Amino acid sequence: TLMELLNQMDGFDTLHRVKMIMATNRPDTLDPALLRPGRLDRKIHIDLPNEQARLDILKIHAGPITKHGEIDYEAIVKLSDGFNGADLRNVCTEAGMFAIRADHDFVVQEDFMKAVRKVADSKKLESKLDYKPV
Amino acid sequence: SSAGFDRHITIFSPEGRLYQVEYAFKAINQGGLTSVAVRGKDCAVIVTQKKVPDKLLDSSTVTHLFKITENIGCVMTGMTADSRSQVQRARYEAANWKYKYGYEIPVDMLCKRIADISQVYTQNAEMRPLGCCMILIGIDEEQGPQVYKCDPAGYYCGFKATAAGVKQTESTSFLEKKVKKKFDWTFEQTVETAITCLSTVLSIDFKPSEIEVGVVTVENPKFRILTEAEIDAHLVALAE
Amino acid sequence: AERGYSFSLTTFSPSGKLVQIEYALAAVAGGAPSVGIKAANGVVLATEKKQKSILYDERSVHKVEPITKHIGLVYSGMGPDYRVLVHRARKLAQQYYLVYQEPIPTAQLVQRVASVMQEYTQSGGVRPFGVSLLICGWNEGRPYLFQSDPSGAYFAWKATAMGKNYVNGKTFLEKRYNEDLELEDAIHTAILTLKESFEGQMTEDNIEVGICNEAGFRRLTPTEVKDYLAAIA
Amino acid sequence: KRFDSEKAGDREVQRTMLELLNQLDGFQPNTQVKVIAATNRVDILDPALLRSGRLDRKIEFPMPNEEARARIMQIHSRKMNVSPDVNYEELARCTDDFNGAQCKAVCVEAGMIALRRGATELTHEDYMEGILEVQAKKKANLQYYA
Amino acid sequence: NQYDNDVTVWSPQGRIHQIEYAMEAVKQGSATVGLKSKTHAVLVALKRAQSELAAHQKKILHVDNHIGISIAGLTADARLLCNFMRQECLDSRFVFDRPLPVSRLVSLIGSKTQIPTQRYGRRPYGVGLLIAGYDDMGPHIFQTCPSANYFDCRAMSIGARSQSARTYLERHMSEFMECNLNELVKHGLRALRETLPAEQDLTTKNVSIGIVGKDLEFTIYDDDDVSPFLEGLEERPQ
Amino acid sequence: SRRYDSRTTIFSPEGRLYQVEYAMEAIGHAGTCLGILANDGVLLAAERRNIHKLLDEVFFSEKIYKLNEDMACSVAGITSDANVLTNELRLIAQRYLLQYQEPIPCEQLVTALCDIKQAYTQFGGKRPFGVSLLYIGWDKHYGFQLYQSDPSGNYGGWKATCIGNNSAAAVSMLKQDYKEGEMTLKSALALAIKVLNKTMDVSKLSAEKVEIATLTRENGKTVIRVLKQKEVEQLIKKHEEEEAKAEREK
Amino acid sequence: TGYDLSASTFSPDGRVFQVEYAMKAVENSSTAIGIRCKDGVVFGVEKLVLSKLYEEGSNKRLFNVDRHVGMAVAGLLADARSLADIAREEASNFRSNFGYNIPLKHLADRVAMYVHAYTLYSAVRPFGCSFMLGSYSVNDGAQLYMIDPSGVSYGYWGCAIGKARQAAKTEIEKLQMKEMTCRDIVKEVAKIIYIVHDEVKDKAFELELSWVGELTNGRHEIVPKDIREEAEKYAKESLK
Amino acid sequence: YDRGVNTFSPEGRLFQVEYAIEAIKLGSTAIGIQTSEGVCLAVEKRITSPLMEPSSIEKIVEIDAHIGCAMSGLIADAKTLIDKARVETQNHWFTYNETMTVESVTQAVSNLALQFGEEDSRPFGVALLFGGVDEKGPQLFHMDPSGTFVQCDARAIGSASEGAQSSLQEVYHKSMTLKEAIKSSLIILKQVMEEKLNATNIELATVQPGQNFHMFTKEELEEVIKDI
Amino acid sequence: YDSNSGGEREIQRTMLELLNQLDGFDSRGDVKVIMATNRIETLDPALIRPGRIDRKIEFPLPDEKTKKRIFQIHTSRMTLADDVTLDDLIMAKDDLSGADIKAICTEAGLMALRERRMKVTNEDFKKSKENVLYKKQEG
Numbered sequence A: 001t002l003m004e005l006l007n008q009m010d011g012f013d014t015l016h017r018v019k020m021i022m023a024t025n026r027p028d029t030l031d032p033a034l035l036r037p038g039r040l041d042r043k044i045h046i047d048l049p050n051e052q053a054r055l056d057i058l059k060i061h062a063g064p065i066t067k068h069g070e071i072d073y074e075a076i077v078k079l080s081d082g083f084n085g086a087d088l089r090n091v092c093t094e095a096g097m098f099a100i101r102a103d104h105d106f107v108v109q110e111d112f113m114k115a116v117r118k119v120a121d122s123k124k125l126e127s128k129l130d131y132k133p134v
Numbered sequence B: 001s002s003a004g005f006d007r008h009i010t011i012f013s014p015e016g017r018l019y020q021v022e023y024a025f026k027a028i029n030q031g032g033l034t035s036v037a038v039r040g041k042d043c044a045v046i047v048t049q050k051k052v053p054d055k056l057l058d059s060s061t062v063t064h065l066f067k068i069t070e071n072i073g074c075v076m077t078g079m080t081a082d083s084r085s086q087v088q089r090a091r092y093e094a095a096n097w098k099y100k101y102g103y104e105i106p107v108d109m110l111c112k113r114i115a116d117i118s119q120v121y122t123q124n125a126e127m128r129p130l131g132c133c134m135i136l137i138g139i140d141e142e143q144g145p146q147v148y149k150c151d152p153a154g155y156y157c158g159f160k161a162t163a164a165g166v167k168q169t170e171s172t173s174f175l176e177k178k179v180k181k182k183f184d185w186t187f188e189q190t191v192e193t194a195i196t197c198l199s200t201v202l203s204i205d206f207k208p209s210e211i212e213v214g215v216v217t218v219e220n221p222k223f224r225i226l227t228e229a230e231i232d233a234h235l236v237a238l239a240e
Numbered sequence C: 001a002e003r004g005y006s007f008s009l010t011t012f013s014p015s016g017k018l019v020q021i022e023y024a025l026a027a028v029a030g031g032a033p034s035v036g037i038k039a040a041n042g043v044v045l046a047t048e049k050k051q052k053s054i055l056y057d058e059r060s061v062h063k064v065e066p067i068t069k070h071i072g073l074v075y076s077g078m079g080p081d082y083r084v085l086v087h088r089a090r091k092l093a094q095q096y097y098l099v100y101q102e103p104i105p106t107a108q109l110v111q112r113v114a115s116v117m118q119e120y121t122q123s124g125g126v127r128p129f130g131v132s133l134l135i136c137g138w139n140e141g142r143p144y145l146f147q148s149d150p151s152g153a154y155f156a157w158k159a160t161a162m163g164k165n166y167v168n169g170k171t172f173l174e175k176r177y178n179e180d181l182e183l184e185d186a187i188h189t190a191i192l193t194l195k196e197s198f199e200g201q202m203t204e205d206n207i208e209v210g211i212c213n214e215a216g217f218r219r220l221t222p223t224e225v226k227d228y229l230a231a232i233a
Numbered sequence D: 001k002r003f004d005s006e007k008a009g010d011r012e013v014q015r016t017m018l019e020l021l022n023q024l025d026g027f028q029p030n031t032q033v034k035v036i037a038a039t040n041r042v043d044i045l046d047p048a049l050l051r052s053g054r055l056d057r058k059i060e061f062p063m064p065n066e067e068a069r070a071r072i073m074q075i076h077s078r079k080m081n082v083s084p085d086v087n088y089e090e091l092a093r094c095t096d097d098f099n100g101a102q103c104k105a106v107c108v109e110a111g112m113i114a115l116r117r118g119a120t121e122l123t124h125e126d127y128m129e130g131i132l133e134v135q136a137k138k139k140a141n142l143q144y145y146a
Numbered sequence E: 001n002q003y004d005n006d007v008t009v010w011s012p013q014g015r016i017h018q019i020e021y022a023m024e025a026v027k028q029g030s031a032t033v034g035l036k037s038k039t040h041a042v043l044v045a046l047k048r049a050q051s052e053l054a055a056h057q058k059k060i061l062h063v064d065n066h067i068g069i070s071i072a073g074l075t076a077d078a079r080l081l082c083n084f085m086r087q088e089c090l091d092s093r094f095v096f097d098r099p100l101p102v103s104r105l106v107s108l109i110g111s112k113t114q115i116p117t118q119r120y121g122r123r124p125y126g127v128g129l130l131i132a133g134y135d136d137m138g139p140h141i142f143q144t145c146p147s148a149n150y151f152d153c154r155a156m157s158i159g160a161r162s163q164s165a166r167t168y169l170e171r172h173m174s175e176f177m178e179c180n181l182n183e184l185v186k187h188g189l190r191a192l193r194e195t196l197p198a199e200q201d202l203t204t205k206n207v208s209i210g211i212v213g214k215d216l217e218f219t220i221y222d223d224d225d226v227s228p229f230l231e232g233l234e235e236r237p238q
Numbered sequence F: 001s002r003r004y005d006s007r008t009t010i011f012s013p014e015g016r017l018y019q020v021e022y023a024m025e026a027i028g029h030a031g032t033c034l035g036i037l038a039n040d041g042v043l044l045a046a047e048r049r050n051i052h053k054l055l056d057e058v059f060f061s062e063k064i065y066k067l068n069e070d071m072a073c074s075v076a077g078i079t080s081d082a083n084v085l086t087n088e089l090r091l092i093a094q095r096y097l098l099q100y101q102e103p104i105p106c107e108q109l110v111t112a113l114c115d116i117k118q119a120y121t122q123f124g125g126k127r128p129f130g131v132s133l134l135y136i137g138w139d140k141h142y143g144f145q146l147y148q149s150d151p152s153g154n155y156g157g158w159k160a161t162c163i164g165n166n167s168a169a170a171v172s173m174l175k176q177d178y179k180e181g182e183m184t185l186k187s188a189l190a191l192a193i194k195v196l197n198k199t200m201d202v203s204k205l206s207a208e209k210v211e212i213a214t215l216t217r218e219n220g221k222t223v224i225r226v227l228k229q230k231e232v233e234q235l236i237k238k239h240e241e242e243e244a245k246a247e248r249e250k
Numbered sequence G: 001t002g003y004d005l006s007a008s009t010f011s012p013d014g015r016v017f018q019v020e021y022a023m024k025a026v027e028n029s030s031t032a033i034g035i036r037c038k039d040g041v042v043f044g045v046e047k048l049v050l051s052k053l054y055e056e057g058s059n060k061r062l063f064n065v066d067r068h069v070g071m072a073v074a075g076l077l078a079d080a081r082s083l084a085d086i087a088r089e090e091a092s093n094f095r096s097n098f099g100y101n102i103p104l105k106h107l108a109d110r111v112a113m114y115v116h117a118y119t120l121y122s123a124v125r126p127f128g129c130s131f132m133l134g135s136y137s138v139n140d141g142a143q144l145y146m147i148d149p150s151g152v153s154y155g156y157w158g159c160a161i162g163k164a165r166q167a168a169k170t171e172i173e174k175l176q177m178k179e180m181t182c183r184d185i186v187k188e189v190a191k192i193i194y195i196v197h198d199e200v201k202d203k204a205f206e207l208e209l210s211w212v213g214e215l216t217n218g219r220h221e222i223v224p225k226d227i228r229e230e231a232e233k234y235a236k237e238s239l240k
Numbered sequence H: 001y002d003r004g005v006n007t008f009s010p011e012g013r014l015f016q017v018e019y020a021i022e023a024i025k026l027g028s029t030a031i032g033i034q035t036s037e038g039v040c041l042a043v044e045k046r047i048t049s050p051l052m053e054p055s056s057i058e059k060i061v062e063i064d065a066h067i068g069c070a071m072s073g074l075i076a077d078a079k080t081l082i083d084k085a086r087v088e089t090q091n092h093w094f095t096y097n098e099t100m101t102v103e104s105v106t107q108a109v110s111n112l113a114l115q116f117g118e119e120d121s122r123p124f125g126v127a128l129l130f131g132g133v134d135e136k137g138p139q140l141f142h143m144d145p146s147g148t149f150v151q152c153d154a155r156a157i158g159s160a161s162e163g164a165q166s167s168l169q170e171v172y173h174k175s176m177t178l179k180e181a182i183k184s185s186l187i188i189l190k191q192v193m194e195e196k197l198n199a200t201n202i203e204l205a206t207v208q209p210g211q212n213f214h215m216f217t218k219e220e221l222e223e224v225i226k227d228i
Numbered sequence I: 001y002d003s004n005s006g007g008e009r010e011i012q013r014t015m016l017e018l019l020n021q022l023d024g025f026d027s028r029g030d031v032k033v034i035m036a037t038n039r040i041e042t043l044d045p046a047l048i049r050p051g052r053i054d055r056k057i058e059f060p061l062p063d064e065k066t067k068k069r070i071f072q073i074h075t076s077r078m079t080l081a082d083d084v085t086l087d088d089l090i091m092a093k094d095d096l097s098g099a100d101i102k103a104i105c106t107e108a109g110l111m112a113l114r115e116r117r118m119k120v121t122n123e124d125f126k127k128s129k130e131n132v133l134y135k136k137q138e139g
């Protein structure tokens, strides 16, 4: 199957108008064929969310959620380091999914930092083998 | 290619490689720190930072800038448990130099002696190689300031500007262009570059309280640690 | 005493070969090229030291570490294991100079050092050195050139080489270097053969040239190093 | 996902799993019909399993407490005829590295020798007997300990 | 299964199996129940033998005048530590001309067994010592384990199926502090009598009892010396 | 720490010595040395391992070591490995001459070294010595003696020798050329050159690849003759003349 | 496979599992935290109840090593007692060769060096004890150090150990380390300890407390519970 | 799973000691008897071939003047303990001007029971039967390689010791006279041996407070042979 | 292993199933099985109890009398010269099996084919013997 991809992108053909995007866990298996330009011209690795970007992604998940008038996001940014942008949202949702036990409609961020700190740190215990090659 | 106990002990691979020291090389990444060493004409600047996960952290106890000699400071990387063990032996060897030879140590020979002991850790397979990274400075008579580094390969090293560790690979290539050209180095020049190499890698631009900036200059040769108040002055000086 | 295990880690292969020592020979081949030439008046050694980044300064670390005023030396392989036996031989020549009050012979250094080194291969619980020494010096008017190995054997060559492509370089030194020539020629063909496997950049800091005159060893400064080779070879 | 290619025999199942996770990625409707997963050991775990639609709630399940080991076996033997003399504390303290299912094995062991006993009703001492029976292992002999 | 080889290796769960395997040796020893009151202390042990002709092996042995001890498990390391135990007695008895309070005494024992629980090539010590003694504040009862943890108690028990004895303890040990020596003795052996099978004695020679007091020096009681203690007791029911 | 040792000291359940078997296999390779029975003298020769003409050859006798004025040795194996043993036995000989002021006889000499080597075999897991080296010399009592060292700790002393495994054909040659009381050391020298002229793989018998060290008995100097290749070449051509004369029969 | 056996042996991930297993070994112990006020240092220990088990006041984890320093330990009790002897003997060396109170810093450093040293050889094992170190003095002040089985020497105003850790130090931000005197810190800590550590896992338990500072005149001792009886008074009424 | 040879078993106990008890099964059997008049002890020499010299192997040697002993399993293994114990009791006689008791030999050997290890090597698997006459009269003691001592009236070792204790307690009683015990030993011996009874197959070790030493002498056994 | 197959432990499991096949449960049929190898120490003792528990033989090295017999049996069909003696031949040889003394005779007859002679002389026999003698002694 490679040979079809490889020969059609080493053509003998104009792919200029068409566009292609490739994704993987690691660029270990891609061979010198796909790591070569042509087929794969550019490479953009994802990086861990910066704390400045972490504040942003936090902001977009606080919108639909209902909170108390007293809110401080920086507490979460400082307490949450190295997490994945998905894992941040899972933590926000877990903060809300912890409020249903308290049955309260409006939820303060104190209860949030409770669920955040505890559960997120549990994610760190399950974070083994997260280191991935370049 | 691996055969026998060579993964568990210190020997030569079928290709001649050593597995333990290459593991200790990446042992620094578990510390998650960064250290940059820049030397000027009359000066040398050392910049680092620290992590403050809890508001209960004391800035004084967790400071990563260690002072071996009144005129010679140092810094470390990776885990601190291993660095501390090397601290007291650095100091001990400084004092024995001062006792035996009656004069201050060039610091050139300090990293060499230390690196010999590091060879012993590399040789014996029944003891831990101690993969902490040693970074030093020094002052020599009419030789200007000096910057040394030591890695747990059992060897000594020292250059103009050298930065080794987790993210230091990218800071290096950034420094190589700033050094030359023809660019000369003064005091405020080096101080102002210390943050540029950190920003290009990080670009966090945060409170100066987390970062520690060491310097060694020949005015009063005594090593001095910079206060946050003056550090912030340089930080607002570089941003116009 | 460590606990004092001291069990030899090198078994004898079914063919009689040594395991760890041949692997250490692989570390010698993976090291850096270093040539030497014994001709006429004295011995000339040529090492190579290249920096991995432009931030490096070679005025600090020296590859040529003379053990005596009239006895120099270079190496190939890993450096850490080199420094060890350096300080060793320094303490080792001093008993000779203390008992006899006479400069120790180059051939004596080899025997003493390689005996301790061979014992270092037989000593239990520790790996041999991965460094092949090239020893020189002038004694009794006739200078000398020796070459050591991790197993501890010692040879005598007019012109030899270690490091990568040392078998290719050796055929070059055989044909291109012969009989006996002055120290100037000794420098010349040394730098030519070193420029064989060297990169397309040759500076005073890329290599160093050590020389043993019958007047004694003198380590040349990078100034003269770039003066002879500029205009390399 | 092993490490080095090629290849993994499960690799088609890793692609299928990563296609499942991809289903929870590129497609929103997978937010319906919950799916539960369970592993005997987390030694090998795909890092990609961390998400709200992927694995989220995570609990490490240790050995049951003594209080638990007492009650679970009582809920297991509640159908069986038992003499109304038990300590309950005894067995609970006497259980280390034991499992709740081992407790079921102990309740059956109690009835296994009850056949040769002839007693139509289970007794207290039968329990501890069965405990020491299957655990821990066997056998050798009681000597050298005076 | 290969990580249980050494004493130095930490299990993936952090539990070193060498100590646990020694605890099994403690459980294979005879059931012995020690107890103390606010005034006098009574220790009880059980004698066992392999053949009928063989004399039952004694457990409780006298060290200090006010310090008796029981034993279970390996007798090798037991008598080794017993030589150490004698040493520490006569030590302060010579230098300070006074005995040692057991509190500070067993700390020395735990530090003694700390080294062989850590250094490679060394093994732990299987131990069933239950130590009793009188300082100025009265009696003390401790316990010994290969883990080198000593716990101050009023009563403790080790050996085969010795937990069932504890079950009799909890309710009785609170009310046995006021009683005098007499009933305290038989209350000691009442815990063992439920450890052994109920269809047989429990003779005079298969059992060891000792009594120690503030004003009463410790004397080893065995055989006919147990006859005054066993007499006047009620047999176990069916 | 017990799992790291390969147990080089303990035996092999087959009855053989595991380390020692591989040890002897090293002597089978590398070094090659010969020995023969000669009257009023003794002869030794070896094949140089580095036949490359770029060497300096400043070491004089290389594969032939002289441990004493009355005795010498022919080494086969790793050079430095021997070089521990040469200075060792050299000190033992010199402390005999120190204590008794008498030349050490070959017997107890050799056996002393052999027990030293045996020590490394029965304890310590140490690397035994895989160097089997020869022995020559003269004593007042027994006169000329020939001995041989073995890794196993037994001395392999005979009147002839096989070093290394390439010389096992020289032993079969020596059983056909066996002689008792005939020297003419030059006859035994043309014999030993006849050995390498056939059994050795290298042909033409290059005089620079071998070294012949003879020791003739002299009172009381015990002259040690180290010969140059110039007079060996004419001797080799005399041997080849003997070969050319032997083919003249048929 | 076998990489986790010897602590001196590295792992393909560039660390040592023996330290790692030793860490959670201390986590399974009962919760023992620490906190320091301005004029002193507060210690606390929670003692579990399994069966009875024995007499109250036995094998408490609160040990007194020095005049002004004490040991609040967690994890395996034996190793803690042995290390308490080690700190005792070290403090004795200081008092012998100098004759004044050993500063907290170099004390915990001397211990930390041993903690790290028993992890550089295959003979001995990493320690399974983590303990709190704190002291107060008039020419010193209030310092609290936290020592971990890896051998890292640092310290905060408060720290938490045992099965309840993150949840144990969560409410610490609510408490004022500075304004609140030590007299009040006692009850402030005890009430949360009574509320934390849920009784479903352990039905019964017992709580120990210790303090040193200016009120005791530098003398470190376990605060007498018959005195003031602070905990149960406010802790039994703090459940609502 | 060979662990430091000193390491506990999972069950458990000392590996090498547990294994060393099995070496008693392969050794010769010996049956001692304690009598009020004295202590009699017998063994089977187990003669393999007529090449064997009768007086070359003796399973019973007297450690102290009034205290004997009997070994088990391997011979040279006990040699080391034998000759050293006699020195122990001797020095006791020097310091206290009085001989060592039968019970004292027990702790004497128990202190040296297990000295094996590596730092700071194999435990002996020879069991010991201590005979002798202390201040309380004729006594017979038994000890094991693990170091556990126990006082036995009539104890057997070796291979058939399990079967020998069997027929032992059947015929054993406390009113045993010494002359009766003597001929009671040989009854079991002749059942457990393959060779015919002769003066070279077995030996009798007897000791009494009023008859000593004794030890034993030749031709005395020859009269016991015809007593069957 | 040959070609691409794995692995060391799967190899063992096919051998173990060979034992249960051979043990065995439940077959009384024969198919008598004989096993042979050079080194018995490699095979696991797990294989011996099912078979062969009754009989295993060891092959000793031949002595002077045996080697004399061996030469007799091979040279029975061959024609040799009168001067060939059987004493010196077996004396010069040390630890040789039947096929070795066989191969030296085969090469003696092969060399005798160069002269086209059916009777092998002792000089030709010894010169041929030296070829295999040099063969084993060359490397």
Ligand SMILES: Nc1ncnc2c1ncn2[C@@H]1O[C@H](COP(=O)(O)OP(=O)(O)OP(=O)(O)O)[C@@H](O)[C@H]1O
Pocket (backbone or CB within 6 Å): I066, I069, I070, I073, I097, I098, I099, I100
């Ligand atoms: N006593 C004897 N009499 C006659 N012939 C014998 C005697 N001993 C051995 N032989 C012959 O010598 C031969 C020895 O065979 P050899 O051991 O050389 O085979 P091989 O090539 O090693 O076989 P494989 O390679 O399968 O092990 C046998 O074929 C046998 O016929």
